[PDB]
Amino acid sequence: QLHYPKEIENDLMNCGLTEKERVEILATAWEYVRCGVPEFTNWEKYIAFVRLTALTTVAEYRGKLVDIDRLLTPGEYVLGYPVRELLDTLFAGTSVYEAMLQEYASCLLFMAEKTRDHQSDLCKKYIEAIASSPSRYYRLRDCDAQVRLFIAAAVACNDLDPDFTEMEYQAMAEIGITLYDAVAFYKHRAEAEVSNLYAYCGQDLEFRQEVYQTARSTLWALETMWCKTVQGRSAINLLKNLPLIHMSMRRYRFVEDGLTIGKPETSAVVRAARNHVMERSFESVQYMLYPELKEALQLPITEMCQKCTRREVYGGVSEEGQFGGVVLCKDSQEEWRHYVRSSESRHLDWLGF
């Protein structure tokens, strides 16, 4: 049986979902928020955030249903949700308000763009931006996985105003993504995903084990330094639980894989992948794009490495073991591997240890 609060039990009715899909989305949204934000004080903001995480979950599953251009419009209901009102309840009167409005809209925009019928030019530029540098992969994946959004929401649901610096958010995202992308590796590869750190860094277990161990070690140093503050614990709770959801949430396949993690041949998500089978402009969406994404989507073709292998159209069918975007050259792949292996110096700098 799936469980979630009565408050949300009638959400997402009459939106194009089966009763099975709808109850799975609501349970997933609730579990994600409980796992990522276990400590809260404000129930009204907590439920608003659960509802926004439900819409995010719909955007990932069936993005065609979500009117991206209405998410930030006051008075507008998207699949029954007053999205801008929920964002205002959560973030209005905090220092991160205007930035989190663009973070939310930008995340859902590219979730919808990636499910689309045919590759848009926004999609193609995103696919090439994330392959263009490791720091740009981490910033854009941060938005895609809602890392800094969850951290700020966690602080807001404790009735405090987030005061992390830009470099603290970048350190937190690099730790969380390095862990999460490692555990999701086999699901993401079986689905020929573009948004996985190891699509660019390399598929060898030895690299993954090494940088996982370093990120978890830095996270334990961060936890030891920050655990006496509510804001500190709000960031720790979110980052630490990112990989653990593979075991804690009923959306993942821990039980169905024989109580295993990291074994692709017993995996229910990999076996599902194996068994399986009107154009938004930069102009129309720029109001909602955060600055790093705007620059990411306008990087000149010529200022990117010309040795890496791009294509006209990404997606379509691929062999077992292949991810779905830009294939880095040896020099670029060496650049990424070296950036990730250097995390400890960069982060002890960025986090103020």
Cβ distance 12 to 27 under 8 Å? no
Residue 182 interacting partner from a copy of itself, Zn ion, none (CB closer than 5 to 8 Å by kind): a copy of itself
Q: What is the DSSP letter of 64?
A: G
Q: Tell me whether residue 26 or residue 90 sits nearer to a copy of itself (CB atom).
A: 26
Cβ distance 237 to 38 under 8 Å? yes
Min CB(197)–Zn ion separation in Å? 16
Q: Tell me whether residue 12 or residue 328 sits nearer to Zn ion (CB atom).
A: 328
| Cα 321 to Cα 184: distance, rounded to the nearest angstrom | 14
Exposed/middle/buried for residue 196 (C-beta within 10 Å: 0-12, 13-18, 19+): buried
3-state secondary structure of 52: helix
Min CB(28)–a copy of itself separation in Å? 12
Q: Tell me whether residue 97 or residue 226 sits nearer to a copy of itself (CB atom).
A: 226
Min CB(201)–a copy of itself separation in Å? 14
Q: What is the DSSP letter of 23?
A: H
Cβ distance 296 to 142 under 8 Å? no
Min CB(189)–a copy of itself separation in Å? 14
Q: Half-sphere exposure of residue 198, counting CA atoms within 13 Å on the CB side?
A: 26
Min CB(316)–Zn ion separation in Å? 22
Applying the rule CB under 5 A, the residues between 253 and 292 that interact with Zn ion are: none
| Cα 22 to Cα 100: distance, rounded to the nearest angstrom | 26
Applying the rule CB under 5 A, the residues between 304 and 333 that interact with Zn ion are: 305, 307-308, 329, 332
Q: Tell me whether residue 16 or residue 38 sits nearer to a copy of itself (CB atom).
A: 38
Rounded to the nearest angstrom, the gap between the alpha carbon of residue 67 and the centroid of all alpha carbons in its chain is 20
| Cα 259 to Cα 255: distance, rounded to the nearest angstrom | 5
Cβ distance 343 to 215 under 8 Å? yes
Bridge partners for 81 per DSSP:
78
Residue 308 interacting partner from Zn ion, a copy of itself, none (CB closer than 5 to 8 Å by kind): Zn ion
Q: What is the largest CA-CA distance in the chain?
A: 55
Binding site for a copy of itself (CB under 8 A): 1-5, 30-31, 34, 38-39, 43, 182-183, 185, 205, 208-209, 212-214, 216-217, 220-221, 223-224, 227-228, 233, 236-237, 240, 243-244, 247-248, 250, 254-263
Q: Which of 250, 283, 284 is nearest to 268 (CA)?
A: 250
Q: Tell me whether residue 256 or residue 335 sits nearer to a copy of itself (CB atom).
A: 256
Q: Tell me whether residue 158 or residue 170 sits nearer to a copy of itself (CB atom).
A: 158
Min CB(187)–Zn ion separation in Å? 26
Interacting span for Zn ion (CB under 5 A) from 3-11, 67-75, 227-235, 298-306: 298-306
Residue 332 interacting partner from Zn ion, a copy of itself, none (CB closer than 5 to 8 Å by kind): Zn ion
Q: Which of 110, 257, 129, 237 is nearest to 183 (CA)?
A: 257
Min CB(39)–a copy of itself separation in Å? 5
Q: Tell me whether residue 48 or residue 131 sits nearer to Zn ion (CB atom).
A: 131
**Which residues bind to Zn ion, rule: CB under 5 A?**
305, 307-308, 329, 332
